[PDB]
Scaffold this active site. Structure first.
Site, PDB file in Angstrom:
ATOM      1  N   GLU A  35       0.820  -1.214   0.000  1.00  0.00           N
ATOM      2  CA  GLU A  35       0.000   0.000   0.000  1.00  0.00           C
ATOM      3  C   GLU A  35       0.855   1.265   0.000  1.00  0.00           C
ATOM      4  O   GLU A  35       0.531   2.238  -0.690  1.00  0.00           O
ATOM      5  CB  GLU A  35      -0.943   0.012   1.209  1.00  0.00           C
ATOM      6  CG  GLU A  35      -2.089  -1.007   1.146  1.00  0.00           C
ATOM      7  CD  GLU A  35      -3.158  -0.668   0.097  1.00  0.00           C
ATOM      8  OE1 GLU A  35      -3.151   0.455  -0.448  1.00  0.00           O
ATOM      9  OE2 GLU A  35      -3.976  -1.550  -0.222  1.00  0.00           O
ATOM     10  N   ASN A  46      -7.731   9.493  -5.318  1.00  0.00           N
ATOM     11  CA  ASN A  46      -8.567   8.585  -6.099  1.00  0.00           C
ATOM     12  C   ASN A  46      -9.455   9.339  -7.089  1.00  0.00           C
ATOM     13  O   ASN A  46      -9.652  10.551  -6.999  1.00  0.00           O
ATOM     14  CB  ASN A  46      -9.445   7.717  -5.193  1.00  0.00           C
ATOM     15  CG  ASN A  46      -8.658   7.023  -4.105  1.00  0.00           C
ATOM     16  OD1 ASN A  46      -7.678   6.339  -4.382  1.00  0.00           O
ATOM     17  ND2 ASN A  46      -9.086   7.195  -2.863  1.00  0.00           N
ATOM     18  N   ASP A  48     -12.633   9.452  -7.438  1.00  0.00           N
ATOM     19  CA  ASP A  48     -13.854  10.050  -6.913  1.00  0.00           C
ATOM     20  C   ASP A  48     -13.568  11.305  -6.086  1.00  0.00           C
ATOM     21  O   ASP A  48     -14.486  11.900  -5.520  1.00  0.00           O
ATOM     22  CB  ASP A  48     -14.631   9.010  -6.089  1.00  0.00           C
ATOM     23  CG  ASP A  48     -13.878   8.558  -4.851  1.00  0.00           C
ATOM     24  OD1 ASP A  48     -12.691   8.911  -4.702  1.00  0.00           O
ATOM     25  OD2 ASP A  48     -14.448   7.799  -4.053  1.00  0.00           O
ATOM     26  N   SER A  50     -11.703  11.408  -3.314  1.00  0.00           N
ATOM     27  CA  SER A  50     -11.178  11.063  -2.011  1.00  0.00           C
ATOM     28  C   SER A  50      -9.663  10.883  -2.100  1.00  0.00           C
ATOM     29  O   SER A  50      -9.075  10.843  -3.182  1.00  0.00           O
ATOM     30  CB  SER A  50     -11.810   9.776  -1.486  1.00  0.00           C
ATOM     31  OG  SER A  50     -11.595   8.691  -2.376  1.00  0.00           O
ATOM     32  N   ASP A  52      -6.304   8.634  -0.118  1.00  0.00           N
ATOM     33  CA  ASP A  52      -5.807   7.581   0.771  1.00  0.00           C
ATOM     34  C   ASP A  52      -4.563   8.067   1.520  1.00  0.00           C
ATOM     35  O   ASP A  52      -3.660   8.650   0.914  1.00  0.00           O
ATOM     36  CB  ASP A  52      -5.435   6.324  -0.026  1.00  0.00           C
ATOM     37  CG  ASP A  52      -6.616   5.693  -0.724  1.00  0.00           C
ATOM     38  OD1 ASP A  52      -7.768   5.946  -0.340  1.00  0.00           O
ATOM     39  OD2 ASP A  52      -6.384   4.919  -1.665  1.00  0.00           O
ATOM     40  N   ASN A  59      -8.898   5.511   3.467  1.00  0.00           N
ATOM     41  CA  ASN A  59      -9.652   6.355   2.539  1.00  0.00           C
ATOM     42  C   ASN A  59     -10.460   7.429   3.262  1.00  0.00           C
ATOM     43  O   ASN A  59     -11.214   7.121   4.188  1.00  0.00           O
ATOM     44  CB  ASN A  59     -10.616   5.478   1.736  1.00  0.00           C
ATOM     45  CG  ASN A  59     -10.866   6.000   0.342  1.00  0.00           C
ATOM     46  OD1 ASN A  59     -10.964   7.199   0.121  1.00  0.00           O
ATOM     47  ND2 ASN A  59     -11.015   5.087  -0.607  1.00  0.00           N
ATOM     48  N   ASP A 101     -15.550  -4.522   9.847  1.00  0.00           N
ATOM     49  CA  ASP A 101     -16.836  -4.064   9.338  1.00  0.00           C
ATOM     50  C   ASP A 101     -17.536  -5.090   8.451  1.00  0.00           C
ATOM     51  O   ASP A 101     -18.630  -4.812   7.952  1.00  0.00           O
ATOM     52  CB  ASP A 101     -16.666  -2.725   8.601  1.00  0.00           C
ATOM     53  CG  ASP A 101     -15.915  -2.852   7.294  1.00  0.00           C
ATOM     54  OD1 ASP A 101     -15.655  -3.984   6.819  1.00  0.00           O
ATOM     55  OD2 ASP A 101     -15.548  -1.794   6.737  1.00  0.00           O
TER      56      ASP A 101
END
Length: 129
Positions: A35, A46, A48, A50, A52, A59, A101
Site C-alpha cells: 500500500e 482517487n 472520486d 477522495s 488515501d 480512505n 466491518d
C-alpha cells in the site's frame, strides 16, 4: 517515517494486530509494503476525489476527515493528517475498525491482489518478535 520490515512488524505486534480478527502478522506487513512501501507519509488521490493516507492508505471517503471530500464520513473520528504520523497508533486503531466491518482485509485492494493466498509468513521471517 520509512519503516524497516522487522521494525514495522514489531510495532504492529505491540499494537495488537497479530491475529486480530484472525489475520496473522504477515498479512498486515504485506499490506503495508504494497500500500505505502512502509512510508507513513504516503498519500494518493482517487478518481472520486477522495484521498488515501498513511502506511495503510486509509480512505477519506469513509474513515477520516480531510476537509475536501464532500459528503464523506469520518468513521474513525480523526483528521486524515493524523494517519501520516511517525507514530502508527492512529492508523492501527482505525485499521482495526475497518477490518471489523464485514469485509475483512478485502478492504485493501493491494492485500487482495498481492498478499491474499500467498506465503505471508515470509514477511516476518527473520525478525526479533
Amino acid at each position: 517515517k520509512v519503516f524497516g520490515r522487522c521494525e514495522l512488524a514489531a510495532a504492529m505486534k505491540r499494537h495488537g494486530l497479530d491475529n486480530y480478527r484472525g489475520y496473522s502478522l504477515g498479512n498486515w506487513v504485506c499490506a503495508a509494503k504494497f500500500e505505502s512501501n512502509f512510508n507513513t507519509q504516503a498519500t494518493n488521490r482517487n478518481t472520486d476525489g477522495s484521498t488515501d493516507y498513511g502506511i495503510l492508505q486509509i480512505n477519506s471517503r469513509w474513515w477520516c476527515n480531510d476537509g475536501r471530500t464532500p459528503g464523506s464520513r469520518n468513521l474513525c473520528n480523526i483528521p486524515c493528517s493524523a494517519l501520516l504520523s511517525s507514530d502508527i497508533t492512529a492508523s492501527v486503531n482505525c485499521a482495526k475498525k475497518i477490518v471489523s466491518d464485514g469485509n475483512g482485509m478485502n478492504a485493501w485492494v493491494a492485500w487482495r491482489n498481492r498478499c491474499k493466498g500467498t506465503d505471508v509468513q515470509a514477511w516476518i521471517r527473520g525478525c526479533r518478535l
